[PDB]
Amino acid sequence: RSGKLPKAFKIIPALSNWEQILYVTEPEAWTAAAMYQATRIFASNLKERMAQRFYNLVLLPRVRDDVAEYKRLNFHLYMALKKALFKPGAWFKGILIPLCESGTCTLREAIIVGSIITKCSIPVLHSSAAMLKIAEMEYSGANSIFLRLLLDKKYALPYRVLDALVFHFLGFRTEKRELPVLWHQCLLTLVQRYKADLATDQKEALLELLRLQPHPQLSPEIRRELQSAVPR
Amino acid sequence: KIFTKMAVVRYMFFNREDVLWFKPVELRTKWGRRGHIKEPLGTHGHMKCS
Amino acid sequence: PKKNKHKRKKVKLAVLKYYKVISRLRRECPSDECGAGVFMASHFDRHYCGKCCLTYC
Amino acid sequence: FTYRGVDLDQLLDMSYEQLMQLYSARQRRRLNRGLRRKQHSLLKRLRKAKKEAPPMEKPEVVKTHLRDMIILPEMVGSMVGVYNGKTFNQVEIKPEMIGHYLGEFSITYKPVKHSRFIPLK
Amino acid sequence: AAHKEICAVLAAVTEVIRSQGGKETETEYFAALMTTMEAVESPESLAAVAYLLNLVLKRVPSPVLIKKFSDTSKAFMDIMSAQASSGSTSVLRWVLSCLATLLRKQPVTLQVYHGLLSFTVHPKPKIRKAAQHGVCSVLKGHPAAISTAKFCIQEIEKSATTTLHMLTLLKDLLPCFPEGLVKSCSETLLRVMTLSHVLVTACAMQAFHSLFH
RNA sequence: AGUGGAGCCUGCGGCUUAAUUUGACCCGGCCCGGACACGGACAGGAUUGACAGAUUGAUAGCUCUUUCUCGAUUCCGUGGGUGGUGGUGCAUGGCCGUUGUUGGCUGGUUAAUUCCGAUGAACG
RNA sequence: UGUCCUACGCCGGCAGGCGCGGGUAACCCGUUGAACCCCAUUCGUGAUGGGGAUCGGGGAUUGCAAUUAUUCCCC
């Protein structure tokens, strides 16, 4: 519950054989406060690729079943994910993208960890790598939230990344599947924030996307932002 | 916190003996319900109201 | 009784104490991951490791 | 002063294990069961406060929540601020409070303090 | 990952390794590792050779077993003394079973039989379990019956926990006895009946069952 | 036979109290808490983790000292410039449960094929 | 009724300690040696040897901890 931890725990980050130590410790049998205690020391003095291994095997399974059980994330587990985001390189490749590639992520998982991105600071070069990696693969009902909140970061977007996002949008040209409303605010935030960095050929590219894939309510506002967009 | 004809109200006053000075006058809500100051709770102006 | 935050003591040129002129002034850790670069503390009653918390007295 | 026919000065010389028979049955059981880290740390703080204090007045007040710790004979003359849940009561340990606890000198409750019709028509 | 394979010791060692050099079975391997069984006490290396020692000799080198029985007996009667001074089990359990294996296929012989028999009272259960199973296979597969019953009676008279193992020994060893030893055993099983202890009573009751069944 | 009267105990009201939680409550002390822009500091160093003692009501590097170690993972301020992890009901697509028959052991543990550890098919 | 019910031996005046056994139970506790009841003794209408509250001093047990008396015993 509380109090000082034994000193045998504080040497596990610098212990030679973590795998036998962690498996015999039964990480699934730990308490909720143990996640905040363990993640704090495993992201403080531990290296980047090493900490990414800890997130995949321990932190990502423990955050998935808890939100699947109570439909809510515990306070201690919330600060564990806050402390994991202290190292952004290990958290992207250990928590975010493996959840993105799992395919079973839902809205609640997306909307809970998405608020963590908004509430904390992420370096631009680390964040821009998450932009390109999530733009390449396919689109589900949860990864769009990973886009729009990261577009809300208002970072200095690299121009190679801007091609990757519009290629993802140009990929959605001939599909007759209905696009959700949340897809439109993802498009709305994109044309709200990066209207000055889009090209003239990219200007008309999103316009025909509005022609073939319109919305009865939100499409004129997307039309308004495009028509009032300054070139580079 | 609200119960069946029983409530505790916060931020109305900040001292325990403020509500003793304003006890014998009634209370009302925006939605038409009325109430009476029953008893102070203590040290931060909290009271229980009926 | 306000909760004041710790401020790390900015020691001026803390790098420039582990050598002279050649050899290492301080001890080196005998562990596998810690050592050959990991200096040890030289306290007045103990020796302490900043990575694996190794303690020699 | 005498406590169980034993004066104060050799009672201060007296160690714990022969203090067993001078206390009552309750305190004798408690001393066998041991003293936890919470009261070992407090006894050092009273010892530290008596150390640095001027030798012609009482020491500084020590505030604590330990209402369940019996008064060892070396605690005499100390200034303990004992807490009743609301405020800290400053009690000066006389040598007559040896077998007693600390909680009963800070009372946690207040005393309670508690026109007929005649017809006119 | 390497025990469940066909190439592992589970299946194929029991089939094709008996053909030592292609002909089954040559004991030249066990007649080549004396430098491991002598002056080498490395653990789990004497254990793994003890596995194959039990596993291979089941496939009838019986004319080979007859001639060099003395060579085997001296090669193990010193083993019976060696790690008995050290106190291990893993090297010990299979070497007692292969002793039962060589004794099953077959003046000096009874000493090896007494060497197998004296390990039945051993406190370690694995060593006792193989010796318990080893004695049954040797006798059922008899001149050795008379001496081993004389061991069984004297052990009961010497003694509480060891008697349970001895009544388990007497459970399936009464049928291979002659008349006088059954008559002596019938007294000895009946003596412990006077003790009111319940677990020794039930095993001795069940021992008479396996006599008559 | 009692209860109603006496002593004690138990429940509703009522009375005092900070609360005497209700047809969990009261005092204290901790934890955590945006991004954008601009102006600063930032390898001379931004910053993370720590042994010992203490304040504290206690321990606690979540605090107050002695400096040991990680290094861009950065941390100080000012803007009326943006900022739902809300609870709750309706239509809405998939999915469980709901209204027969025949087969088929490395290891340590114990009196004991004892204990723990790895490890399939058709017919109506 | 139960794996917490207890038998038996020793110690102390009592609460209570130490040891060793039985019973997953028409198997041990347990022939469940219960209390009123029955037979003798003292008391003799007296707030009395009725009644026990409220208290003082000490001892023992469970609990991290017994203070505002956890509980039990003696005067």
Short mmCIF file of N, CA, C and O in Angstrom, two decimals, chain E residues 34 37 69-80 95:
data_model
loop_
_atom_site.label_atom_id
_atom_site.label_comp_id
_atom_site.label_asym_id
_atom_site.label_seq_id
_atom_site.Cartn_x
_atom_site.Cartn_y
_atom_site.Cartn_z
N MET E 34 35.41 -45.76 -17.37
CA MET E 34 35.89 -45.96 -16.01
C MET E 34 36.58 -44.72 -15.47
O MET E 34 36.47 -44.43 -14.27
N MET E 37 33.70 -42.82 -13.97
CA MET E 37 33.24 -43.39 -12.71
C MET E 37 34.35 -43.54 -11.67
O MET E 37 34.04 -43.83 -10.51
N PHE E 69 29.99 -60.29 -15.21
CA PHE E 69 29.19 -59.94 -14.03
C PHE E 69 30.08 -59.48 -12.88
O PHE E 69 29.73 -58.53 -12.17
N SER E 70 31.22 -60.15 -12.69
CA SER E 70 32.16 -59.75 -11.65
C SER E 70 32.76 -58.38 -11.95
O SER E 70 33.02 -57.60 -11.02
N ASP E 71 33.01 -58.09 -13.22
CA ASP E 71 33.53 -56.78 -13.60
C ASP E 71 32.53 -55.68 -13.28
O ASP E 71 32.90 -54.61 -12.79
N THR E 72 31.25 -55.92 -13.57
CA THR E 72 30.22 -54.95 -13.23
C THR E 72 30.06 -54.82 -11.73
O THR E 72 29.94 -53.70 -11.21
N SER E 73 30.09 -55.94 -11.01
CA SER E 73 29.83 -55.93 -9.57
C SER E 73 30.90 -55.13 -8.83
O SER E 73 30.57 -54.34 -7.94
N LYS E 74 32.17 -55.31 -9.20
CA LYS E 74 33.22 -54.50 -8.58
C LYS E 74 33.17 -53.06 -9.07
O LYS E 74 33.67 -52.16 -8.40
N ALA E 75 32.57 -52.83 -10.24
CA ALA E 75 32.47 -51.46 -10.74
C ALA E 75 31.36 -50.69 -10.05
O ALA E 75 31.26 -49.47 -10.19
N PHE E 76 30.49 -51.39 -9.31
CA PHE E 76 29.40 -50.69 -8.65
C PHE E 76 29.40 -50.87 -7.14
O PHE E 76 28.85 -50.01 -6.44
N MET E 77 30.02 -51.93 -6.61
CA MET E 77 30.07 -52.08 -5.16
C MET E 77 30.93 -50.98 -4.54
O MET E 77 30.73 -50.62 -3.37
N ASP E 78 31.88 -50.45 -5.31
CA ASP E 78 32.62 -49.27 -4.90
C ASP E 78 31.82 -47.99 -5.11
O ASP E 78 32.03 -47.00 -4.40
N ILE E 79 30.93 -47.97 -6.11
CA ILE E 79 30.00 -46.86 -6.27
C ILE E 79 29.02 -46.82 -5.10
O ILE E 79 28.64 -45.74 -4.62
N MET E 80 28.63 -47.99 -4.59
CA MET E 80 27.72 -48.05 -3.45
C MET E 80 28.35 -47.45 -2.20
O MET E 80 27.65 -47.03 -1.28
N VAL E 95 21.62 -45.87 -10.84
CA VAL E 95 22.64 -46.91 -10.72
C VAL E 95 22.13 -48.07 -9.87
O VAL E 95 22.57 -49.21 -10.04
#
